[PDB]
Amino acid sequence: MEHVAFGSEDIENTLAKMDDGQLDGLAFGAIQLDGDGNILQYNAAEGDITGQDPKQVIGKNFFKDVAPCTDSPEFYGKFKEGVASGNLNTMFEYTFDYQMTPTKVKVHMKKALSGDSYWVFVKRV
Ligand SMILES: *C(=O)/C=C/c1ccc(O)cc1
């Protein structure tokens, strides 16, 4: 059985072997992006943090329309560096504040096993 948590050293392996219901049962927000930042998957925990339905944001561009506050060197910039290098794996604190009460979070971005895909994990702090 899986026992993955925010920050698990092998998180991308566990999540590669999970289905959507399992993604929605995680305690942390979990978003999958393509290399351009378009949203492929968006779990229930993340939608609860951001007060909306995951189905409404699938297909949108994370950095452009959903989370413009993350369009910054420290987040979008680091994302693109990790996409390019094939080694995305970075953790930092951030404040989410577009169309929502400003909320402090810890973020962990990590390359997915599935091709052209990248995870963004989020938890409250
Ligand atoms: C800043 O604009 C961040 C917004 C945000 C972050 C993460 C989400 O899932 C949704 C919006």
UniProtKB/Swiss-Prot annotation:
GO MF entries: identical protein binding; photoreceptor activity
UniProt-listed GO biological process terms: phototransduction; regulation of DNA-templated transcription
CDD domains: PAS
Pfam families for the chain: PAS (PF00989)
Modified residues (S-(4-hydroxycinnamyl)cysteine): C69
SUPFAM superfamilies referenced in this protein's UniProt entry, alphabetically: PYP-like sensor domain (PAS domain)
Domain PAS: residue ranges: 23-86
Keyword Flavoprotein: no
InterPro entries associated with the record: PAS, PAS-like_dom_sf, PAS_fold, PYP
Presence of keyword Methyltransferase: no
Keyword list, A-Z: Chromophore, Photoreceptor protein, Receptor, Sensory transduction
PTM annotation: The 4-hydroxycinnamic acid (p-coumaric acid) chromophore is covalently bound via a thioester linkage.
UniProt cross-references to SMART domains, sorted A to Z: PAS
Function according to Swiss-Prot or TrEMBL: Photoactive blue light protein. Probably functions as a photoreceptor for a negative phototaxis response.
Subunit composition and interactions: Monomer.
Family: Belongs to the photoactive yellow protein family.
Protein's recorded name: Photoactive yellow protein
Species per Swiss-Prot/TrEMBL record: Halorhodospira halophila (Ectothiorhodospira halophila)
